[PDB]
Symmetry: none
């Protein structure tokens, strides 16, 4: 490939005043 791009992963820009969790999978999970 020359200059192409493939999106992946997980991202959260701004998280203000919140409860995040309680059984959460945030990210990239890969099995081969």
């Amino acid at each position: 490939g020359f200059g192409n791009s493939r999106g992946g992963g997980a991202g959260l820009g701004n998280n203000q005043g919140s409860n995040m969790g309680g059984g959460m999978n945030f990210g990239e999970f890969s099995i081969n």
Copy 2:
């Protein structure tokens, strides 16, 4: 490929004043 783009992954721009979770899968899950 020359300059093309393929979307993937997961992203959240702004999360303000919220509860996020309780059994949540946020991201990219791949199996081969």
Copy 3:
């Protein structure tokens, strides 16, 4: 390909004052 684009993944621009979760799959799930 030269400059083409293929949409994928999942994205949420703005999430303000909400409950998001409770058994949610947010992202890209691929199996080969």
Copy 4:
């Protein structure tokens, strides 16, 4: 291809004051 585009994935622009979840699949699910 030269400059063409193929839509895919899932996106939500603005989500304000809501409950989103409770058994929800939001994204791209592909199996080959």
Copy 5:
């Protein structure tokens, strides 16, 4: 192809003051 476009995926512009979920499939589901 030269400059053509094929629509796909799923998108929601603005969602304000709502309950979205409870057994919902929002996105692109493909099997080959």
Copy 6:
């Protein structure tokens, strides 16, 4: 199943400002 979805449990944003008197049973259950 592969990627389906099913709502369950208590719902989303129910009983909003609903003055009860009592005795109610709300959700997904079984009474013997």
Copy 7:
């Protein structure tokens, strides 16, 4: 299952400002 989702437990943002009197049973349970 692979990547499906199911809501369960208590819901999302229920009973918002709901004046009760008592006795209620809320969620996913079983009473004997």
Copy 8:
């Protein structure tokens, strides 16, 4: 299962400012 998700337990942001009287049983349980 591989990567699915299921809500459970108490919910998300429930009973917001809900004046109770008593006796309620909230969540995912069983009473004998």
Copy 9:
């Protein structure tokens, strides 16, 4: 399981400013 997720226990941000009277049982439990 591989990478799934399940909510459980007490929830997220529940009972926000909720004047109780007493007697409530909240979470994921069992009463005999």
Copy 10:
């Protein structure tokens, strides 16, 4: 399991400024 996640115990940020009267049982437990 490999890399999954499960919420448990008391929750996240519950009972925020909630005037109780007493008697409540909160979390993940069992009463005999």
Copy 11:
């Protein structure tokens, strides 16, 4: 008000393979 909703702002769900700009106002512009 009790539970009502007023729509506003601007949101774009999915934008794939496009040129957006060149003198564009995208959002909410308010003067008092």
Copy 12:
């Protein structure tokens, strides 16, 4: 107000393979 919601701001869910800019106002502009 009790539980109502007012939409505002600007959000873009997914932007893949594009040029965005060149004299663009994306957001909320308020003057009092």
Copy 13:
């Protein structure tokens, strides 16, 4: 107010393979 929500700001969920800028205002601009 009790539990209401007002949308504002600017957020972009996913931006993959793009040029963003060249005279761009992305955010919240307020003058009093």
Copy 14:
């Protein structure tokens, strides 16, 4: 206020393979 939320600021979830800048204002600009 009791539990309400006001959106603001600027956030970008995922930015992959891009040029961002060249005269860009990304954030919150306030004058009083």
Copy 15:
């Protein structure tokens, strides 16, 4: 205020393989 939240600032979740800068203001700029 009791438990409310006001969004502000600027945040970028994931930035991979990019050029960011060349005359960029990323953050919060306030004058009183």
Copy 16:
């Protein structure tokens, strides 16, 4: 002006794969 916007300079994504021969003058300029 307060918050308006005007496109200028070279455009967005022009001349995509356009075989020229020469001599062209492209943008916002003036030739004497």
Copy 17:
């Protein structure tokens, strides 16, 4: 001005894979 925006200079992603022959003048300039 307060918070406006104007594109200028060379554009965004122009001339993508455009075989030239020569002589072109591209951008925002003036030739005497």
Copy 18:
């Protein structure tokens, strides 16, 4: 000005894989 923005100079990601022949003048300049 207060917080405005203006693109300038060479652009963003221009001439991607563009076979030239020579002689071009690219950017924001003036030739006498």
Copy 19:
């Protein structure tokens, strides 16, 4: 100015893999 921004100089990620022949003048300059 207070907090504005202006692109200038050479751009961002230009000429990616662009086979030249020679003679080009790139950036923000002036030739006499």
Copy 20:
């Protein structure tokens, strides 16, 4: 100025793998 920003000089990550022939003048300069 107070806190503004201006790009200048050579750019960011330009000419990536660009086979030249010679003679080019790159950056922010002036030739007499």
